[PDB]
Amino acid sequence: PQITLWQRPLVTIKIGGQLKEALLDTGADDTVLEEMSLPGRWKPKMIGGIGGFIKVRQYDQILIEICGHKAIGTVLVGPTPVNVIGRNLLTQIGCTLNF
Amino acid sequence: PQITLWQRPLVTIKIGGQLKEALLDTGADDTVLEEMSLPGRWKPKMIGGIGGFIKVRQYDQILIEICGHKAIGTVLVGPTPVNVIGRNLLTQIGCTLNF
Ligand SMILES: NCCOC(=O)Cc1cccc2ccccc12
Numbered sequence: 001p002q003i004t005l006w007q008r009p010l011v012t013i014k015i016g017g018q019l020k021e022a023l024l025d026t027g028a029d030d031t032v033l034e035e036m037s038l039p040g041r042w043k044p045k046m047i048g049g050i051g052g053f054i055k056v057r058q059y060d061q062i063l064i065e066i067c068g069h070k071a072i073g074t075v076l077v078g079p080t081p082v083n084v085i086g087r088n089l090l091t092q093i094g095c096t097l098n099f
Numbered sequence: 100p101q102i103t104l105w106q107r108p109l110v111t112i113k114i115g116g117q118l119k120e121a122l123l124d125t126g127a128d129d130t131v132l133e134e135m136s137l138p139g140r141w142k143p144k145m146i147g148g149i150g151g152f153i154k155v156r157q158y159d160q161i162l163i164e165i166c167g168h169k170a171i172g173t174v175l176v177g178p179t180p181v182n183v184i185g186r187n188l189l190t191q192i193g194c195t196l197n198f
Protein backbone atom coordinates (compact mmCIF):
# COMPACT_ATOMS: atom_id res chain seq x y z
CA PRO A 1 0.00 0.00 0.00
CA GLN A 2 0.78 3.68 -0.12
CA ILE A 3 -0.13 5.40 3.13
CA THR A 4 -0.51 9.11 3.47
CA LEU A 5 0.00 10.85 6.83
CA TRP A 6 -2.94 13.25 7.19
CA GLN A 7 -4.05 10.92 9.96
CA ARG A 8 -2.19 8.53 12.27
CA PRO A 9 -1.06 5.47 10.32
CA LEU A 10 -2.87 2.88 12.39
CA VAL A 11 -3.08 -0.59 10.91
CA THR A 12 -4.51 -3.90 12.00
CA ILE A 13 -1.86 -6.53 12.60
CA LYS A 14 -2.05 -10.31 12.75
CA ILE A 15 0.14 -11.70 15.55
CA GLY A 16 -0.03 -14.58 18.00
CA GLY A 17 -3.34 -15.81 16.55
CA GLN A 18 -4.91 -12.45 17.44
CA LEU A 19 -5.71 -9.11 15.85
CA LYS A 20 -4.30 -5.91 17.30
CA GLU A 21 -4.05 -2.29 16.14
CA ALA A 22 -0.65 -0.65 15.98
CA LEU A 23 0.89 2.59 14.71
CA LEU A 24 3.52 2.53 11.97
CA ASP A 25 6.13 4.63 13.75
CA THR A 26 9.31 5.48 11.87
CA GLY A 27 10.43 7.33 15.02
CA ALA A 28 10.51 4.11 16.95
CA ASP A 29 13.51 1.84 16.72
CA ASP A 30 11.66 -1.17 18.10
CA THR A 31 8.25 -2.81 17.95
CA VAL A 32 6.36 -2.69 21.25
CA LEU A 33 2.94 -4.19 21.90
CA GLU A 34 0.49 -4.72 24.72
CA GLU A 35 0.43 -7.86 26.80
CA MET A 36 -0.05 -11.04 24.91
CA SER A 37 1.28 -14.59 24.76
CA LEU A 38 3.98 -15.39 22.24
CA PRO A 39 6.17 -18.44 21.72
CA GLY A 40 9.82 -18.76 22.57
CA ARG A 41 12.29 -17.94 25.27
CA TRP A 42 12.05 -14.29 26.25
CA LYS A 43 14.35 -12.05 28.22
CA PRO A 44 13.59 -8.73 29.92
CA LYS A 45 14.56 -5.51 28.15
CA MET A 46 14.58 -1.93 29.47
CA ILE A 47 13.32 0.51 26.81
CA GLY A 48 12.98 4.26 26.46
CA GLY A 49 15.64 6.21 28.29
CA ILE A 50 14.32 9.73 27.99
CA GLY A 51 12.96 10.35 31.49
CA GLY A 52 13.23 6.74 32.56
CA PHE A 53 12.67 3.22 31.27
CA ILE A 54 10.02 0.55 31.17
CA LYS A 55 10.64 -3.17 31.25
CA VAL A 56 9.23 -5.36 28.51
CA ARG A 57 9.71 -8.96 27.38
CA GLN A 58 11.79 -9.39 24.26
CA TYR A 59 10.59 -12.18 21.94
CA ASP A 60 12.72 -12.85 18.87
CA GLN A 61 11.82 -14.38 15.48
CA ILE A 62 8.10 -13.71 15.84
CA LEU A 63 5.88 -13.77 12.80
CA ILE A 64 3.63 -10.83 12.10
CA GLU A 65 1.34 -9.84 9.31
CA ILE A 66 0.79 -6.16 8.45
CA CYS A 67 -1.74 -5.14 5.84
CA GLY A 68 -1.29 -8.61 4.40
CA HIS A 69 2.50 -8.46 4.32
CA LYS A 70 4.24 -11.03 6.51
CA ALA A 71 7.40 -10.42 8.42
CA ILE A 72 9.60 -12.02 11.06
CA GLY A 73 11.39 -10.13 13.77
CA THR A 74 11.63 -9.10 17.41
CA VAL A 75 8.47 -8.03 19.25
CA LEU A 76 8.73 -6.39 22.66
CA VAL A 77 5.71 -7.18 24.86
CA GLY A 78 4.52 -5.37 27.98
CA PRO A 79 2.72 -2.34 29.50
CA THR A 80 3.18 0.00 26.58
CA PRO A 81 0.68 2.82 26.50
CA VAL A 82 0.99 2.81 22.68
CA ASN A 83 1.23 -0.17 20.26
CA VAL A 84 3.87 0.64 17.72
CA ILE A 85 5.38 -1.05 14.73
CA GLY A 86 8.96 0.25 14.77
CA ARG A 87 11.71 0.36 12.13
CA ASN A 88 12.88 -3.15 12.95
CA LEU A 89 9.73 -4.65 11.42
CA LEU A 90 9.15 -1.85 8.90
CA THR A 91 12.39 -2.81 7.16
CA GLN A 92 11.28 -6.41 7.08
CA ILE A 93 8.16 -5.61 5.12
CA GLY A 94 10.07 -3.30 2.79
CA CYS A 95 8.47 -0.12 4.05
CA THR A 96 10.11 3.13 2.96
CA LEU A 97 9.49 6.85 3.29
CA ASN A 98 8.94 8.44 -0.15
CA PHE A 99 8.55 11.98 -1.42
CA PRO B 100 13.95 10.49 -2.20
CA GLN B 101 13.20 6.98 -1.08
CA ILE B 102 14.34 6.39 2.49
CA THR B 103 14.78 2.98 3.98
CA LEU B 104 14.51 2.42 7.74
CA TRP B 105 17.50 0.23 8.66
CA GLN B 106 18.76 3.31 10.46
CA ARG B 107 17.03 6.34 11.99
CA PRO B 108 15.74 8.62 9.23
CA LEU B 109 17.65 11.71 10.24
CA VAL B 110 17.72 14.53 7.72
CA THR B 111 19.19 18.00 7.59
CA ILE B 112 16.55 20.71 7.48
CA LYS B 113 16.72 24.33 6.40
CA ILE B 114 14.69 26.58 8.73
CA GLY B 115 14.99 30.09 10.11
CA GLY B 116 18.18 30.75 8.14
CA GLN B 117 19.84 27.84 9.95
CA LEU B 118 20.58 24.15 9.48
CA LYS B 119 19.30 21.61 11.96
CA GLU B 120 19.02 17.81 12.05
CA ALA B 121 15.63 16.23 12.64
CA LEU B 122 14.04 12.79 12.59
CA LEU B 123 11.24 11.98 10.15
CA ASP B 124 8.78 10.60 12.68
CA THR B 125 5.49 9.22 11.38
CA GLY B 126 4.60 8.49 15.02
CA ALA B 127 4.61 12.17 15.81
CA ASP B 128 1.58 14.27 15.06
CA ASP B 129 3.48 17.54 15.27
CA THR B 130 6.85 19.02 14.38
CA VAL B 131 8.95 19.94 17.42
CA LEU B 132 12.40 21.54 17.33
CA GLU B 133 15.02 22.91 19.67
CA GLU B 134 15.18 26.56 20.62
CA MET B 135 15.50 28.96 17.77
CA SER B 136 14.12 32.28 16.57
CA LEU B 137 11.26 32.26 14.12
CA PRO B 138 9.00 35.00 12.79
CA GLY B 139 5.42 35.62 13.72
CA ARG B 140 3.13 35.74 16.70
CA TRP B 141 3.48 32.60 18.78
CA LYS B 142 1.33 31.13 21.52
CA PRO B 143 2.24 28.53 24.14
CA LYS B 144 1.19 24.92 23.56
CA MET B 145 1.30 21.95 25.96
CA ILE B 146 2.40 18.77 24.15
CA GLY B 147 2.76 15.11 25.00
CA GLY B 148 0.25 13.88 27.54
CA ILE B 149 1.58 10.44 28.30
CA GLY B 150 3.18 10.96 31.72
CA GLY B 151 2.93 14.72 31.58
CA PHE B 152 3.37 17.64 29.20
CA ILE B 153 5.98 20.10 28.07
CA LYS B 154 5.33 23.66 26.99
CA VAL B 155 6.53 24.83 23.60
CA ARG B 156 5.94 27.89 21.42
CA GLN B 157 3.66 27.31 18.46
CA TYR B 158 4.68 29.20 15.29
CA ASP B 159 2.35 28.87 12.32
CA GLN B 160 3.01 29.22 8.57
CA ILE B 161 6.75 28.65 8.88
CA LEU B 162 8.77 27.71 5.85
CA ILE B 163 11.00 24.68 5.98
CA GLU B 164 13.12 22.81 3.52
CA ILE B 165 13.64 19.06 3.85
CA CYS B 166 16.01 17.22 1.55
CA GLY B 167 15.43 20.05 -0.89
CA HIS B 168 11.64 19.92 -0.68
CA LYS B 169 10.03 23.08 0.68
CA ALA B 170 7.00 23.15 2.89
CA ILE B 171 4.96 25.54 5.00
CA GLY B 172 3.37 24.63 8.29
CA THR B 173 3.38 24.83 12.07
CA VAL B 174 6.66 24.38 13.95
CA LEU B 175 6.65 23.93 17.72
CA VAL B 176 9.79 25.35 19.34
CA GLY B 177 11.19 24.62 22.80
CA PRO B 178 13.13 22.22 25.09
CA THR B 179 12.50 19.08 23.12
CA PRO B 180 15.02 16.35 23.78
CA VAL B 181 14.46 15.14 20.19
CA ASN B 182 14.04 17.18 16.97
CA VAL B 183 11.25 15.63 14.99
CA ILE B 184 9.52 16.29 11.72
CA GLY B 185 5.97 15.10 12.41
CA ARG B 186 3.06 14.18 10.13
CA ASN B 187 1.91 17.78 9.86
CA LEU B 188 4.94 18.67 7.72
CA LEU B 189 5.38 15.20 6.21
CA THR B 190 2.02 15.59 4.46
CA GLN B 191 3.08 18.96 3.15
CA ILE B 192 6.08 17.54 1.36
CA GLY B 193 4.05 14.62 0.03
CA CYS B 194 5.76 12.00 2.14
CA THR B 195 4.09 8.59 2.26
CA LEU B 196 4.77 5.16 3.73
CA ASN B 197 5.11 2.55 0.95
CA PHE B 198 5.45 -1.22 0.86
N1 LIG C 1 7.60 8.33 17.55
C1 LIG C 1 8.61 7.74 18.43
C2 LIG C 1 8.06 8.03 19.83
O1 LIG C 1 7.03 7.05 20.00
C3 LIG C 1 7.12 6.15 21.00
O2 LIG C 1 8.07 6.23 21.76
C4 LIG C 1 6.09 5.05 21.22
C5 LIG C 1 6.18 4.46 22.64
C6 LIG C 1 6.72 3.18 22.87
C7 LIG C 1 6.89 2.67 24.25
C8 LIG C 1 6.52 3.46 25.33
C9 LIG C 1 6.03 4.84 25.10
C10 LIG C 1 5.70 5.69 26.27
C11 LIG C 1 5.21 6.99 26.07
C12 LIG C 1 5.03 7.53 24.70
C13 LIG C 1 5.36 6.72 23.60
C14 LIG C 1 5.94 5.37 23.80
Ligand SMILES: NCCOC(=O)Cc1cccc2ccccc12
Pocket residue numbers: 047048049050051052053054149150151
Ligand atom coordinates in the same frame (compact mmCIF):
# COMPACT_ATOMS: atom_id res chain seq x y z
N1 LIG D 1 8.16 11.13 34.50
C1 LIG D 1 8.36 9.82 33.90
C2 LIG D 1 7.97 10.02 32.44
O1 LIG D 1 9.12 9.42 31.79
C3 LIG D 1 8.96 8.47 30.86
O2 LIG D 1 7.83 8.25 30.49
C4 LIG D 1 10.16 7.75 30.28
C5 LIG D 1 9.86 6.72 29.17
C6 LIG D 1 10.00 5.34 29.43
C7 LIG D 1 9.71 4.34 28.38
C8 LIG D 1 9.38 4.74 27.10
C9 LIG D 1 9.34 6.19 26.78
C10 LIG D 1 8.97 6.61 25.39
C11 LIG D 1 8.91 7.97 25.07
C12 LIG D 1 9.17 8.98 26.12
C13 LIG D 1 9.48 8.60 27.44
C14 LIG D 1 9.54 7.16 27.79
Ligand SMILES: NCCOC(=O)Cc1cccc2ccccc12
Pocket residue numbers: 025026027028050124125126127131147179180181183
Ligand atom coordinates in the same frame (compact mmCIF):
# COMPACT_ATOMS: atom_id res chain seq x y z
N1 LIG E 1 7.60 8.33 17.55
C1 LIG E 1 6.64 9.19 18.26
C2 LIG E 1 7.28 9.35 19.64
O1 LIG E 1 8.31 10.32 19.42
C3 LIG E 1 8.27 11.50 20.07
O2 LIG E 1 7.38 11.68 20.88
C4 LIG E 1 9.30 12.60 19.86
C5 LIG E 1 9.30 13.62 21.02
C6 LIG E 1 8.76 14.91 20.86
C7 LIG E 1 8.68 15.84 22.01
C8 LIG E 1 9.12 15.43 23.26
C9 LIG E 1 9.61 14.05 23.46
C10 LIG E 1 10.03 13.61 24.82
C11 LIG E 1 10.52 12.32 25.01
C12 LIG E 1 10.61 11.36 23.88
C13 LIG E 1 10.20 11.78 22.60
C14 LIG E 1 9.62 13.13 22.39
Ligand SMILES: NCCOC(=O)Cc1cccc2ccccc12
Pocket residue numbers: 050051052146147148149150151152153
Ligand atom coordinates in the same frame (compact mmCIF):
# COMPACT_ATOMS: atom_id res chain seq x y z
N1 LIG F 1 8.16 11.13 34.50
C1 LIG F 1 7.91 12.19 33.52
C2 LIG F 1 8.21 11.52 32.19
O1 LIG F 1 7.01 11.90 31.45
C3 LIG F 1 7.10 12.49 30.25
O2 LIG F 1 8.21 12.57 29.76
C4 LIG F 1 5.86 13.00 29.55
C5 LIG F 1 6.07 13.62 28.16
C6 LIG F 1 5.94 15.01 27.96
C7 LIG F 1 6.15 15.61 26.64
C8 LIG F 1 6.40 14.82 25.53
C9 LIG F 1 6.43 13.34 25.69
C10 LIG F 1 6.71 12.50 24.49
C11 LIG F 1 6.77 11.11 24.63
C12 LIG F 1 6.60 10.48 25.96
C13 LIG F 1 6.36 11.27 27.10
C14 LIG F 1 6.31 12.76 26.98
